[PDB]
From Swiss-Prot, chain A:
Cytoplasmic side: 1-256, 310-315
Site feature location: Threonine that confers selectivity for Co(2+) transport: T259
Organism field: Methanocaldococcus jannaschii (strain ATCC 43067 / DSM 2661 / JAL-1 / JCM 10045 / NBRC 100440) (Methanococcus jannaschii)
Compartments, as annotated in UniProt: Cell membrane
Top-level division of the source organism's lineage: Archaea
Span(s) of short sequence motif Probable selectivity filter: 276-278
Sites annotated Essential for ion permeation: N252
Principal localisation: membrane
Protein name: Cobalt/magnesium transport protein CorA
Encoding gene, per UniProt annotation: corA
Cited Pfam families: CorA
Amino acid sequence: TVIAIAKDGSIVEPKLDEISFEDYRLIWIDCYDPKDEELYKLSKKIGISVSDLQIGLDEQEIPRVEEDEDFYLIIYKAPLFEEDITTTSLGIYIKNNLLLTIHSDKIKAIGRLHKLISTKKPRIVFERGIGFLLYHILNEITRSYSRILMNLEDELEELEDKLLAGYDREVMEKILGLRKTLVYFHKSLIANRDVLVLLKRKYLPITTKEDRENFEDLYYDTLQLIDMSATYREVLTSMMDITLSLENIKMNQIMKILTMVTTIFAVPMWITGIYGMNFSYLPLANNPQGFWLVMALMVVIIMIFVYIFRRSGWI
Amino acid sequence: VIAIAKDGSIVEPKLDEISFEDYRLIWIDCYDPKDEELYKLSKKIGISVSDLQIGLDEQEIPRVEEDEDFYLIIYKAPLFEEDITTTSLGIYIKNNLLLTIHSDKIKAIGRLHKLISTKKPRIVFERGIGFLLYHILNEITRSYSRILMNLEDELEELEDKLLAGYDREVMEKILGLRKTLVYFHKSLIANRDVLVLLKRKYLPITTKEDRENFEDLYYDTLQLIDMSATYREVLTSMMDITLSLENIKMNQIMKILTMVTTIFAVPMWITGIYGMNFSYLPLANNPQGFWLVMALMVVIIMIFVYIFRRSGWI
Amino acid sequence: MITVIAIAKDGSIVEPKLDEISFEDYRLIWIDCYDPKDEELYKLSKKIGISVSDLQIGLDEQEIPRVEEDEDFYLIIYKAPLFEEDITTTSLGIYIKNNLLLTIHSDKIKAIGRLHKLISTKKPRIVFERGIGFLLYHILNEITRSYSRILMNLEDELEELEDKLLAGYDREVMEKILGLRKTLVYFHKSLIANRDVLVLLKRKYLPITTKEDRENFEDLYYDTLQLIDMSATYREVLTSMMDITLSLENIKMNQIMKILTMVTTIFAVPMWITGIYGMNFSYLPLANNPQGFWLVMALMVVIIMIFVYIFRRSGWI
Amino acid sequence: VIAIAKDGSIVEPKLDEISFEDYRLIWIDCYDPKDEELYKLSKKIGISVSDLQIGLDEQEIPRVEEDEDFYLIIYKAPLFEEDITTTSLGIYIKNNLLLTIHSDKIKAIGRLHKLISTKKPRIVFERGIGFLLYHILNEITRSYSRILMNLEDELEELEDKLLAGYDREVMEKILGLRKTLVYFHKSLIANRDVLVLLKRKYLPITTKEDRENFEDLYYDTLQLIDMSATYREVLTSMMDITLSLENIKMNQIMKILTMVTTIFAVPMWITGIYGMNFSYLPLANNPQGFWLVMALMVVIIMIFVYIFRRSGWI
Amino acid sequence: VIAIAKDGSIVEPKLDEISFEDYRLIWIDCYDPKDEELYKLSKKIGISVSDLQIGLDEQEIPRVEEDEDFYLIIYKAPLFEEDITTTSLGIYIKNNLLLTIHSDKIKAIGRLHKLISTKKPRIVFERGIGFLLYHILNEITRSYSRILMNLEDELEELEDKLLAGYDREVMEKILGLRKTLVYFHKSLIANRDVLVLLKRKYLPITTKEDRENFEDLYYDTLQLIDMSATYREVLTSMMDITLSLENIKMNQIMKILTMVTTIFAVPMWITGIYGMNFSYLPLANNPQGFWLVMALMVVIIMIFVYIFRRSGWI
Ligand SMILES: CCCCCCCCCCCO[C@@H]1O[C@H](CO)[C@@H](O[C@H]2O[C@H](CO)[C@@H](O)[C@H](O)[C@H]2O)[C@H](O)[C@H]1O
Ligand SMILES: CCCCCCCCCCCO[C@@H]1O[C@H](CO)[C@@H](O[C@H]2O[C@H](CO)[C@@H](O)[C@H](O)[C@H]2O)[C@H](O)[C@H]1O
Ligand SMILES: CCCCCCCCCCCO[C@@H]1O[C@H](CO)[C@@H](O[C@H]2O[C@H](CO)[C@@H](O)[C@H](O)[C@H]2O)[C@H](O)[C@H]1O
Ligand SMILES: CCCCCCCCCCCO[C@@H]1O[C@H](CO)[C@@H](O[C@H]2O[C@H](CO)[C@@H](O)[C@H](O)[C@H]2O)[C@H](O)[C@H]1O
Ligand SMILES: CCCCCCCCCCCO[C@@H]1O[C@H](CO)[C@@H](O[C@H]2O[C@H](CO)[C@@H](O)[C@H](O)[C@H]2O)[C@H](O)[C@H]1O
Ligand SMILES: [Mg+2]
Ligand SMILES: [Mg+2]
Ligand SMILES: [Mg+2]
Ligand SMILES: [Mg+2]
Ligand SMILES: [Mg+2]
Ligand SMILES: [Mg+2]
Ligand SMILES: [Mg+2]
Ligand SMILES: [Mg+2]
Ligand SMILES: [Mg+2]
Ligand SMILES: [Mg+2]
Ligand SMILES: [Mg+2]
Ligand SMILES: [Mg+2]
Ligand SMILES: [Mg+2]
Ligand SMILES: [Mg+2]
Ligand SMILES: [Mg+2]
Ligand SMILES: [Mg+2]
Ligand SMILES: [Mg+2]
Ligand SMILES: [Mg+2]
Ligand SMILES: [Mg+2]
Ligand SMILES: [Mg+2]
Ligand SMILES: [Mg+2]
Ligand SMILES: [Mg+2]
Ligand SMILES: [Mg+2]
Ligand SMILES: [Mg+2]
Ligand SMILES: [Mg+2]
Ligand SMILES: [Mg+2]
Ligand SMILES: [Mg+2]
Ligand SMILES: [Mg+2]
Ligand SMILES: [Mg+2]
Ligand SMILES: [Mg+2]
Ligand SMILES: [Mg+2]
Ligand SMILES: [Mg+2]
């Protein structure tokens, strides 16, 4: 009874719908945004409470591993894209030979796994058993984080040449937005890291020594993802610090103007000030040359200061 | 301010202090006791009222002591109380006896109480005193965990308030979140090394399984330290970004000043020369004059305001 | 320099090059394929028996470093530095199945060039007794060397930007610094992934490596580590440089503000004076005085000299 | 300025020069021993004078050294001497001889002495020269631990004068704590690595219970290092907020200057035009002309004063 | 200068040339040989003149070189020479020989040649050549740790010129220190990884004990890298501070401008209204008029000086 519920198992590589846990050497059941009909049917089939199952579907829930008698619950976060809304998701229940991924959102890695089983359905063999299937699901989810990270890098790219042109509100709002997403993703990477730490550290009925080691690889990958995310955080911050350090420079050229105007008419306005004084005997007031004389001395002053300001270089 | 009890030789019975025992293992909770009751405790257990007074020192540091005839474990738990959050407790263990005495209220502990009790009855316990120790510690860990989720939510909430520019309240809120966070880190660190102990050192009070459990709890505490640290980084981030987004303002201001000042500069000089006291002022007696110069100035102005509208000021 | 699509390697006595057409009579072969057209790829895939798509993975230059089982071959993606007009970059990938080690890359790999040309000196001589894992080692090491060289040169250019930095903030040079920075963040991502590949190669028991091989891949790991650390330090130094120029730009606002403030204080009072003495009342004290103008003019200069003194002394001018 | 001895069979006496054989272990303590005290000492114990002279060098950096016939363990201890906190001491052990020799007063050592002098308790050492080493180091490590609380207090006092605006005192206080903590870094990280040597390698001087001890002491020292670092971080952010806050006030200042300047601009122009002469100054001769123009000016000032109140700004 | 031979049989006989048998291990430190002398040595010891030119390149990088009938170790050692420091020093060890050659002064190998020749050094080696490698590398490491303190004295000096704001000499100096510190860092990293080789892999030239001694060395060298980074950031902090102080003084300036601009604004508007050409100026023809207005302006002024006095700008 599809929801979508996709099913995989055994010797050859058959798909299938609800029935017969045996023979079936291993069975991957995937359940997507199921309506309570599906939810309850699936539950009644696999011997897991509809509420237990619902833990998987609560989508803000934190990545972790848990033992419950007769099944293991792993919660891992997976990236979604949705027009600069980029955030996380899913749960996994393994009991006996059953690995169940049940997710309220779309998991692209699950999709990809499905397409990599889509090559010659009767092909692509597995001797490795459940822990390894868990490994792949997890690995793919990781790869996604990788691709997203590349996207961020492209984003950085764009903003990069808009950098040394000083402040722009649009630019910096884009920068800060990047910072935020970056931190969401970081917190999720952390959470996931630690799931992997457990899986690779503990002995568990579900995983072999080969599995366990595989998860360790997966852990070094995941740590790289962390290291980059943190790196690009520092980068962005720096970008902001540069823009602000440019603004603070225009804060310079500007006062250079203001001081140039103020300083270039100072002596002249003193002049006018004195030659507007109500004294009798303003030397040269009754001089017929006086007005033009003064006009001259002023203009010469101004010219001087404009030279002195020319070099040393200001104007 | 009351003691509590659990678990005799079949299943878990309850309560009375001063009862004949023979019990499997017995949990006794104690809260801000009064010197009388405290003494009563001292007698019933066999530890000194002096050794029991340590666990009561609220700033006392997390650690493990090995002394004869009891084990001491000091551990820091979160403390909520209305916008002001902090840290507390201590534990004593001998034989079948586990003793939690705090001078503040440990919500986790209370949770474990309600959880175990769930009247009546439930939750069979086969694993021993190391395991009770565990659950006490696991619930106390999970408290920090949920409070941290709170600080995360409360942290996002200062996001779009911040965008408004420097705000003294917004600030002090941040600064406080930081205070709480540094605090949380210190304690968290300590508790971590304690766990490093119960997972490492082989003891009489812990089994292999117990040890594994303490190890899980170790990795979890580590995770809380990681989280806490991140949050502090993000706080400092907000702080710096607003604080610094002030300087742009301090810029456009100088834009205004420099524009006013430069726009009327010439018109002022003009008006200055034409205020001069010479017998001859060109145009002075010309009845169109005042309007000719008036226009000179008006056009000078317009020209400057034009130089500024474009390229680019305003 | 020059570069060919396909190349080829050693067999039961020593190493010749080859026909495109040979198979089971050679000890181990190294095929190096560069930027194949789909048709050419189809020829290759046809001969070596690795699938088209499987190979095109190798051909995607954005592909991340890793090691893949995929029974009937091992795959290793490893990051190499790119020059391609002074924008330093990263790429490549590698398949080993049977005695065949295929390096295939969409980009140009300097290291593969180096190895290729070095094999010109097999006369005087050289001898390879060590089998595939060791070849792998040699390619991976050669790439590593490439990074190291890029790094040395960079350390050399830093000290050049170092003095330009002291002439005052320059948008060009800031550009260069920012660019080296970007390059080092690229190197970080890449060197990091590369390293963790090395860690697997030296750790996991693999049919294609042997305790000796792994032994090599270890010192390779450590080497990679040292690259990482050195590069981080180059970045830290770059960031230093930027931060210091800009921080030393933002001071000038001081001499500036001091100038504007100093003109403005030096004539403030004398202006007031000339202002009150321009108010036209009936009686203006000293105004009917023949010497009055010189009196006031003098008061004003003195006020000036004073403020100039309070300025010149006590810092400023 | 002194030497201090210890520990016969069954219990610990205090000994004049000299007695050796029977005693299980012996702890000599030389504080700033004078040249004659060092010759007496050196010949007395059997370790070279110039070799005792290194323990007297306070600059000497922590380590574990194996010489022929004895061991040198140099350690860092917090020293005080008037609100400038710092680091010091060395150690030599051969056979049953532990020797703590120091130029600077070492509080933790003084502490061991003044504690041992009680002797009401058992109080018996079964654990040997190794355990003695542990106890001494462990005490030093405690000293650090306590000074860290000192800092928690002082910091939580500075958090208050933080937003109060840049103060030079607040400044050099912060920068003083800073220096100190950098000190605790160098030292503490070196001390840490000694505990790592002592905890790992098999030494004739240390039993296994001994080593285990030194390990827990490793971890404790890791917390000291970590916390010290965090505190540095905090002081740093404090310098950052005050400084970056004092920065922001140039905004309110340029607001004032700009506002004033802009508020009388148009008016000073008016008075400028109306002071030009210029016969036929429009309105010059209307008796109500004056109040006319002055009305105009006042209104204008009002309209800017308003414009500011309205937008931002005031 | 040039060759120094060592350890003939049992005790330490600073030696003569030729011979080279009936020993355990021989150590020869060449100093800045002139081509003829490095020639003599070269043809004596049987290391190709070029193989030695190796150890003579002060700019060459450290590494652990397996040759046949030879082992090369390059290592970076500090130098003082008037506040300008650098790197150095190849080391060539074949069979039982260990050669240490350098173009610059090695105060470490000097401390070694000086510690071995005091009477009898004396001690002993049952430990083989490896342990001498260790003592050498080690000694050098101690040398570094010792310069670290010099930088410490320079920082100590700077700290009180810090709060006075910018000084060109101070600044350029901090910077200089900083970059020196960076050169140091790069070297320390080099050496380190060399030590990771000796500590890491079995070489027939090192025992397990040796290997482990090299590990201790590694850890110490890590503390050096850690000190290096720590103090670099300290320097950066120093700069950033003094700059922030500057950016604060700017405010006292701007406040001064604003206080002057505001002291006379109203009074200049007043002088502006009374300099108008209106035929009626209220109060002009009044003979107390002048001093009326004047006292008005004056009172305005004082009013503003006070209005600045508190809240105080003045
Ligand atoms: C796992 C460690 C690292 C992974 C996570 C890194 C965080 C950044 C996300 C990656 C790339 O960035 C993501 O890409 C999409 C488009 O593909 C962007 O979409 C859009 O976002 C905003 C909103 O309109 C626009 O400013 C932007 O120009 C546009 O491209 C978006 O800004 C961002 O959400
Ligand atoms: C454009 C519409 C209406 C215009 C009105 C009529 C004409 C314009 C105003 C007249 C100005 O009159 C002006 O005064 C004096 C002459 O007395 C001249 O002065 C000039 O000659 C003397 C030499 O003796 C010089 O010292 C002086 O620097 C120079 O400017 C000037 O060239 C003239 O231009
Ligand atoms: C920016 C201000 C420029 C104002 C100065 C203009 C130049 C004046 C020259 C005109 C004719 O010559 C001028 O005659 C008078 C005589 O009373 C001189 O005055 C001189 O002597 C008398 C002595 O009682 C003084 O009051 C005065 O300070 C002095 O300058 C003046 O120095 C000289 O220069
Ligand atoms: C503030 C900056 C610019 C202003 C400066 C120039 C002043 C002139 C402009 C005033 C408007 O226009 C001009 O002024 C006055 C109006 O009061 C008119 O003159 C009138 O003034 C008043 C009326 O209020 C009457 O007493 C008087 O009999 C009448 O002639 C004049 O006919 C007109 O042409
Ligand atoms: C510094 C700012 C301005 C200074 C003001 C000082 C006040 C002086 C007090 C003495 C009274 O002075 C008197 O006041 C009034 C003001 O309404 C003036 O104006 C009054 O008379 C005129 C002329 O007939 C009328 O047009 C006008 O409606 C009336 O108000 C008057 O010309 C002046 O003679
Ligand atoms: Mg259940
Ligand atoms: Mg189970
Ligand atoms: Mg089961
Ligand atoms: Mg099961
Ligand atoms: Mg199961
Ligand atoms: Mg795949
Ligand atoms: Mg594996
Ligand atoms: Mg006038
Ligand atoms: Mg102005
Ligand atoms: Mg002005
Ligand atoms: Mg493939
Ligand atoms: Mg891999
Ligand atoms: Mg693998
Ligand atoms: Mg397979
Ligand atoms: Mg390098
Ligand atoms: Mg970049
Ligand atoms: Mg890349
Ligand atoms: Mg070998
Ligand atoms: Mg080797
Ligand atoms: Mg600055
Ligand atoms: Mg020994
Ligand atoms: Mg001994
Ligand atoms: Mg300092
Ligand atoms: Mg030779
Ligand atoms: Mg040789
Ligand atoms: Mg060589
Ligand atoms: Mg040879
Ligand atoms: Mg020895
Ligand atoms: Mg010092
Ligand atoms: Mg010096
Ligand atoms: Mg060590
Ligand atoms: Mg007049």
